[PDB]
RNA sequence: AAAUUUUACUCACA
RNA sequence: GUGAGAAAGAUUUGC
């Protein structure tokens, strides 16, 4: 059906591929490709362009944001049981906590400052030295990236050591800052459509547009290129340490460690590679492995190809193409004048995951489509009604609900089929506020979040410290007694107020109800 | 022995960020194993029962949107709307009234939202989420 | 105690008074304000609170007693400390950004930089690759797509029946007949019965791929939504026949046979065999008590079943139909047939896209979008993007790929661009 | 048996 | 069904 669309369509209405296949095959294939590129027989991994144009940021203070350093996502923690290396799959929060415990440091910033100011690699930092940290940070674990549309064979992603993440955070923050300084398109607060519009504005002068993608992007970005870029932007010893760790990286496939001296292991340094391309020229607008350029004559095309080769951005002959009336960047397709190309485009369907999450996500998707002009409002109204009917058919049974209140949705035993316009205008029962894209979280979302918090990798017996005073910074050091006092005082105040738990706060509702 | 000395072995003080990250239960991930999780132990049914009788009769009634203007289809553009965060005194008051501290802190930060919009009005005014085609204005 | 914070403490307290006239904070770096004859536990002393205050940078603790109040000067133009007043007073007082020597910078050169650089030098380096030759030609025409489709047809052929696609059409059986047929089929196959549910026991695996061919398209798929909902429900709860308004299916957990201590309950990694009923007239026929039906089985891992069952058939069809061109009639093999073809077979194709967990149709759709938007493509390389047989494995994915290519061919034939 | 290295673990307690 | 241990358990699967 996607083939018989008047406009453009990527066939995104269904979910991406998935399976329970082990990640051994994909990781092995990626490592083999990296080795082949290293031998210099398949693609180019040697950087030749000049990066002197990039500004130097060596005098900037060393800043670390703890928000991205602690997360519920997976990571690899290395321990030495008796005399061998054991790689354990934990959460990034747990890995960072273990790293700080072994190094005996209050915060990651203290750890990085101590690491950068030791006399020798053998000097001790708590229970470990810099040499041990570098040895442990080169170990990676493999996993499968499923649900990636257009890739029937799922790719291999890699979980890294906490120290590797700690250094990569600084490197990528500074690389992103340098990118934002290089051009106005890489601004932090910019959407995909805004980037596409700027791209259209940039290539209006020329006639032909080359929409290009890079093949084996991660396997062709050597540690040498990363070190070159980092030195160009002035990363000091952090860049050297990261390059050394990347060059000696080992991947644990099943139960064996495989050495992968080439590549950068599936997009660890997207900003750094984007800089590797952008510092050699200004004729490209690239985002990692996807770019668009413009030209008038075959000589300009040859120059573009030479520039791409020099920057280790190997053109994908399978996907890259040339157009005259189209512009594809960040998956977004625009006409040469900057207007959105007619058709479904990147519109993605909403799978059935929760009676109310499905409705909320459908509302968000329909709002996005209607605002952009993809479809008219009445079509969105009809689609929302149909989705409500389908949710009722799928979830209206004793397993999920036992209520019959009229105001409830038909999928929760009710008899209300809310209009899309009525929902978007907040002209409905308060129970429907959670279904609004800007409204509170739904019941299913909270239930799933709690259940996830109860998972094996994330379960903890620590006394939860939630509902804190806004005036207390999150960098403040606390002990067990301190957290006990804070919780006791907050619980006493709440009991005085008569509330057993804090009342959920929504910014939109609070701002609307205000006079 | 307390959990503090085991999770943070060798350290007597840790940042609030780390402690909070160790106990996080407010992040939602859309995953394949959603219907099975909701069915298990009738968790969603129990949560709906609890919400309908303890949490629902606390949400304030939000007035519906009224203002709208004539709009016409136009070239795609980016609408930037700056939603400011709560003031210090406002946050202190809301905390004192028993509102969840985490949500107030999150709302403390000023933020800007960029959305693609393909409709324009005569006076070039902003529109609400998803209502640009109908002309509802932020005002 | 350090001399680098002398200026920092001086500007911290200029004219701040605690009771009526006396300065609240006294700098320890100035003898006039310093208290003689007492130990110094910090760079400032608060008479009102009677405590010591020590200033330190991010990640550089100083040697002071724990009782001393510590103020952290963050590098992002913000400050952190214990007392609210100190945090607020520091923020307003230090509104002017003054650099304090001793702050580590990103470009800091460690004492081991030379050693690490030498070690990197001694490590292997890549070799320059060959310069590719690129020739830009027109995108492939109808002949190339026809050639790819014919290659697939010759290589794999066709099955005699649509195995599980036929389950999209109602069988001529009622609820009780369907349940009886499914239960007796389970009994015939020697499935173990336990706790009122059916389990399939396996011991040895041939460890070779199952035969792959192309499924012919049934006439229509009226029971697509019901089939997907039933698949979801059954793979969520298995062992017993689950019924819909017009059809029913049986999800059987597949478990290893280990003797006495063999597994009794399925886990999150246990696969399922989904058994469905369709009209008789194929090699998979089954009869019992005068009831005849074709029984077809699909082996799915839990993720595959979850992916299949969560798709929305009706919404997807409507969204596609919003801005779709006229769909031509097609035959059982996907070939254009304006005489005996049926336009409902397209729905079947959509159902196939829902039943294929590899979603190769999405890859074909992306490549076709590139084809339609392209003016010139690389020679002998853009065509290879349509050869995805090596990427997938199985009957359902193969059929989905074949019919996606057939849809591309039909679009190029009926509505050329 | 099938979309075929996948459909598999141990202990304590209830 | 809960806890702990296997390079490991379903928020799995990273930037
Ligand atoms: Mg591209
Ligand atoms: Zn058959």
């Amino acid at each position: 059906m996607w083939a018989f669309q008047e406009g453009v369509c990527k066939g995104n209405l269904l979910s991406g591929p998935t399976s329970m296949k082990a990640p051994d095959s994909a990781a092995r294939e990626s490592i083999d490709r990296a080795s082949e590129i290293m031998t210099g027989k398949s693609y180019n991994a040697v950087h030749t362009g000049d990066l002197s144009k990039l500004p130097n940021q060596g005098e900037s203070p060393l800043r670390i944001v703890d928000s991205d350093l602690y997360s519920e996502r997976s990571c690899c923690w290395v321990i030495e049981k008796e005399g061998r290396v054991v790689c354990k799959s934990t959460t990034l929060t747990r890995g960072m906590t273990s790293l700080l415990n072994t190094t005996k440091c209050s915060s990651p910033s203290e750890l990085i400052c101590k690491v950068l100011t030791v006399e020798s690699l053998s000097e001790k930092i708590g229970d470990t030295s810099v040499e041990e940290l570098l040895s442990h940070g080169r170990y990676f674990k493999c996993a499968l990236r499923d649900q990636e549309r257009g890739k029937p064979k799922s790719r291999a992603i890699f979980l890294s050591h906490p120290f590797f993440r700690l250094l990569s955070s600084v490197v990528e923050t500074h690389a992103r800052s340098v990118l934002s300084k290089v051009s106005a398109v890489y601004t932090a607060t910019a959407s995909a459509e805004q980037r596409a519009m700027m791209a259209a504005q940039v290539v209006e002068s020329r006639k032909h547009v080359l929409n290009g993608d890079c093949t084996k992007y991660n396997e062709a970005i050597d540690a040498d290129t990363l070190l070159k870029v980092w030195d160009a932007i002035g990363m000091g010893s952090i860049g050297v340490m990261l390059a050394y760790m990347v060059r000696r990286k080992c991947v644990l496939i099943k139960d064996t460690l495989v050495e992968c001296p080439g590549g950068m292991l599936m997009g660890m340094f997207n900003a750094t590679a984007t800089l590797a391309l952008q510092g050699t020229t200004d004729r490209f607008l690239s985002f990692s492995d996807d770019f668009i350029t413009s030209f008038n004559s075959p000589a300009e095309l040859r120059e573009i190809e030479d520039l791409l080769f020099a920057s280790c951005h190997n053109l994908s002959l399978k996907k890259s193409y040339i157009s005259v009336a189209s512009l594809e960047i960040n998956s977004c397709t625009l006409t040469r004048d900057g207007d959105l190309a007619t058709g479904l485009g990147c519109t993605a369907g909403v799978p059935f995951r929760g009676p109310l999450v499905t409705l909320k996500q459908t509302a968000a998707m329909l709002s996005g489509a209607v605002d952009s002009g993809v479809m008219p409002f009445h079509s969105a109204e009809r689609l929302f009604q149909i989705k409500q009917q389908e949710c009722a058919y799928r979830y209206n049974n004793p397993t999920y609900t036992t209520r019959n209140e009229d105001f409830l949705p038909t999928c929760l035993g009710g008899k209300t089929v809310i209009s899309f316009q009525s929902l978007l205008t907040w002209d409905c029962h308060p129970f429907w506020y959670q279904v609004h894209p800007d409204g509170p979280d739904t019941i299913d979302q909270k239930v799933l979040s709690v259940l996830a918090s109860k998972t094996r990798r994330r379960r903890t017996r620590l006394e939860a410290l939630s509902d804190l005073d806004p005036l207390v910074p999150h960098r403040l050091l606390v002990s067990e007694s301190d957290v006990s006092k804070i919780r006791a005082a907050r619980q006493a105040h709440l009991k005085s107020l008569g509330l057993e738990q804090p009342t959920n706060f929504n910014y939109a509702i609070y701002k609307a109800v205000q006079p | 022995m307390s959990q503090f000395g085991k999770s943070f072995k060798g350290r007597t003080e840790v940042t609030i960020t780390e402690y909070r990250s160790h106990t996080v239960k407010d992040v939602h991930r859309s995953l394949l194993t959603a219907d099975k999780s909701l069915r298990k132990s009738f968790c969603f049914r129990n949560a709906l029962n609890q919400f309908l009788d303890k949490d629902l009769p606390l949400l304030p009634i939000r007035p519906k949107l009224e203002s709208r203007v004539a709009v016409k289809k136009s070239k795609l553009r980016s609408q930037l709307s700056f939603r400011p965060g709560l003031t210090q005194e406002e946050a202190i008051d809301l905390y004192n009234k028993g509102y969840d501290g985490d949500s107030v802190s999150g709302a403390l930060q000023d933020r800007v939202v960029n959305e693609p919009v393909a409709y324009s009005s005569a006076d070039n005014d902003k529109f609400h989420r998803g209502l640009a085609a109908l002309g509802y204005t932020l005002a | 105690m350090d001399s680098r914070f002398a200026q920092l403490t001086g500007v911290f307290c200029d004219d701040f008074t605690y009771s009526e006239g006396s300065r609240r904070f006294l700098s320890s770096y100035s003898t006039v304000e310093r208290r003689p004859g007492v130990p110094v536990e910090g760079d400032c002393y608060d008479c009102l609170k009677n405590k010591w205050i020590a200033f330190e940078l991010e990640g550089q603790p100083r040697k002071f007693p724990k009782a001393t109040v510590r103020c952290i000067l963050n590098n992002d133009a913000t400050y952190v400390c214990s007392e609210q007043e100190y945090q607020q007073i520091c923020k307003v007082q230090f509104k002017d950004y003054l650099e304090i020597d001793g702050v580590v910078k990103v470009g800091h050169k460690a004492s081991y930089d030379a050693e690490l650089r030498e070690r990197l030098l001694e490590l292997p380096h890549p070799k320059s690759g060959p310069k590719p030759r690129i020739e830009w030609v027109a995108p492939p025409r109808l002949a190339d797509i026809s050639k790819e489709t014919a290659e697939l047809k010759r290589q794999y052929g066709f099955f005699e029946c649509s195995k599980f696609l036929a389950c999209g059409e109602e069988c001529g059986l009622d609820q009780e007949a369907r349940e009886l047929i499914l239960n007796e089929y389970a009994r015939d196959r020697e499935f173990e019965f336990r706790n009122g549910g059916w389990i399939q026991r396996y011991t040895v695996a041939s460890h070779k791929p199952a035969t792959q061919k192309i499924l012919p398209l049934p006439a229509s798929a009226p029971l697509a939504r019901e089939l997907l909902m039933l698949i979801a429900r059954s793979t969520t709860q298995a062992g017993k026949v689950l019924h819909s308004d017009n059809t029913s299916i049986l999800a059987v957990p597949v478990m290893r046979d280990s003797g006495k201590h063999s597994k009794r309950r399925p886990t999150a990694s246990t696969h399922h065999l989904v058994v469905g009923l369709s009209k008789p007239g194929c090699e998979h026929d089954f009869e019992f008590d005068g009831y005849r039906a074709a029984v077809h089985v699909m082996h799915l891992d839990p993720k595959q079943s979850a992916n299949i069952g969560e798709q929305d058939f009706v919404s997807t069809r409507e969204i596609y139909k919003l801005d779709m061109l006229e769909l031509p009639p097609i035959s059982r093999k996907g070939d254009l047939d304006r005489a005996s073809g049926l336009e409902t077979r397209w729905d079947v194709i959509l159902l196939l896209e829902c039943l294929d967990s590899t979603r190769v149709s999405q890859a074909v759709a992306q490549h076709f979008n590139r084809h339609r938007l392209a003016l010139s493509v690389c020679k002998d390389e853009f065509r290879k993007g349509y050869q995805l047989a090596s990427e997938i494995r199985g009957t359902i994915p193969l059929s989905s790929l074949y019919y996606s290519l057939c849809a591309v061919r039909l679009r190029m034939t009926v509505h050329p661009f």
Side-chain angles (χ1 to χ4, degrees), chain C residues 160-163 166 278 281-285 294-296:
Chain C
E160 295 318 313
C161 69
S162 354
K163 311 229 231 166
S278 76
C282 83
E283 100 192 352
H284 314 98
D285 276 306
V295 175
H296 293 120

Side-chain angles (χ1 to χ4, degrees), chain C residues 61-88:
Chain C
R62 321 212 279 170
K63 293 180 179 180
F64 275 121
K66 294 178 180 179
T68 307
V69 177
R70 308 299 222 289
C71 191
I72 315 304
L73 285 91
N74 304 150
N75 300 309
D76 55 306
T78 177
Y79 309 84
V80 158
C81 155
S82 150
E83 308 298 343
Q84 203 205 277
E85 176 56 25
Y86 302 161
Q87 185 214 320
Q88 297 279 309

Side-chain angles (χ1 to χ4, degrees), chain A residues 93-143:
Chain A
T93 291
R94 278 225 222 162
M96 197 71 31
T97 295
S98 307
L99 178 67
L100 296 166
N101 290 346
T102 63
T103 294
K104 285 168 202 0
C105 279
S106 278
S107 84
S109 162
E110 192 194 304
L111 162 50
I112 216 181
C113 306
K114 273 177 180 178
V115 156
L116 275 171
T117 68
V118 285
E119 317 294 28
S120 64
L121 288 167
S122 54
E123 174 157 322
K124 239 62 178 312
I125 318 186
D127 286 321
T128 179
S129 54
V130 175
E131 183 78 57
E132 180 109 326
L133 281 170
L134 292 177
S135 161
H136 287 179
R138 80 203 183 83
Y139 287 112
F140 292 79
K141 278 191 134 207
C142 67

Side-chain angles (χ1 to χ4, degrees), chain C residues 113-152:
Chain C
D113 208 281
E115 188 183 8
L116 286 185
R117 284 191 185 276
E118 177 252 342
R119 276 138 84 121
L120 262 167
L121 204 50
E122 313 323 329
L123 280 166
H125 294 266
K127 322 256 198 51
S128 207
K131 186 97 166 49
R133 263 305 308 310
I134 307 167
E135 337 194 8
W136 298 97
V137 304
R141 340 209 74 241
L142 174 77
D144 313 295
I145 322 302
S146 285
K147 202 170 311 314
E148 274 306 304
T149 285
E151 183 64 14
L152 273 186

Side-chain angles (χ1 to χ4, degrees), chain A residues 4-252:
Chain A
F4 287 78
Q5 300 286 297
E6 179 95 278
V8 304
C9 189
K10 303 230 172 24
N12 279 0
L13 291 192
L14 299 179
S15 299
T18 206
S19 151
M20 293 231 87
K21 191 191 207 123
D24 309 20
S25 209
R28 174 66 45 58
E29 195 254 336
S30 157
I31 283 148
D32 300 337
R33 290 297 98 65
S35 306
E36 257 144 22
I37 289 161
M38 196 103 188
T39 77
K41 290 331 179 103
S42 99
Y43 298 98
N44 177 39
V46 179
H47 204 269
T48 290
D50 203 74
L51 299 170
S52 59
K53 133 176 185 152
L54 300 170
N56 184 326
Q57 290 211 144
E59 257 55 27
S60 296
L62 176 59
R63 102 201 65 261
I64 301 182
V65 306
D66 290 37
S67 91
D68 55 36
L69 265 175
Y70 298 103
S71 142
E72 82 290 355
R73 308 312 194 120
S74 302
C75 96
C76 156
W77 177 246
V78 168
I79 76 188
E80 312 235 24
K81 271 280 148 266
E82 53 99 16
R84 71 193 209 281
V85 159
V86 171
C87 296
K88 288 212 99 58
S89 300
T90 65
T91 73
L92 187 61
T93 291
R94 278 225 222 162
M96 197 71 31
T97 295
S98 307
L99 178 67
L100 296 166
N101 290 346
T102 63
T103 294
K104 285 168 202 0
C105 279
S106 278
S107 84
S109 162
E110 192 194 304
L111 162 50
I112 216 181
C113 306
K114 273 177 180 178
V115 156
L116 275 171
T117 68
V118 285
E119 317 294 28
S120 64
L121 288 167
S122 54
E123 174 157 322
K124 239 62 178 312
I125 318 186
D127 286 321
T128 179
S129 54
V130 175
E131 183 78 57
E132 180 109 326
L133 281 170
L134 292 177
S135 161
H136 287 179
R138 80 203 183 83
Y139 287 112
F140 292 79
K141 278 191 134 207
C142 67
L144 222 61
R145 167 94 298 272
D146 77 337
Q147 300 256 296
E148 225 183 9
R149 263 159 207 141
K151 274 118 199 73
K153 225 205 288 299
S154 285
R155 293 199 280 199
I157 49 159
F158 302 86
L159 330 177
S160 90
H161 198 264
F163 192 57
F164 200 90
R165 290 264 47 92
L166 174 63
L167 300 192
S168 314
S169 324
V170 170
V171 153
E172 229 62 32
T173 294
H174 281 280
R176 272 185 256 105
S177 167
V178 174
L179 265 169
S180 325
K181 274 203 274 318
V182 152
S183 167
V185 174
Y186 302 96
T187 322
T189 54
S191 72
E193 293 84 348
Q194 228 179 353
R195 282 175 217 285
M197 284 148 27
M198 288 202 228
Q201 255 287 120
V202 155
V203 305
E204 184 101 67
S205 147
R206 318 285 212 300
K207 169 159 172 243
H208 292 311
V209 160
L210 163 63
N211 321 276
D213 276 75
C214 301
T215 190
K216 322 270 172 243
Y217 191 65
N218 317 123
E219 297 82 303
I221 295 283
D222 214 42
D224 291 338
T225 309
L226 299 171
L227 188 57
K228 197 187 187 180
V229 171
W230 294 333
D231 283 343
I233 63 177
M235 284 291 117
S237 287
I238 278 154
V240 173
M241 256 180 317
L242 265 166
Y244 180 66
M245 265 187 293
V246 169
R247 174 64 76 212
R248 307 201 40 228
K249 64 197 175 286
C250 280
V251 181
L252 167 61

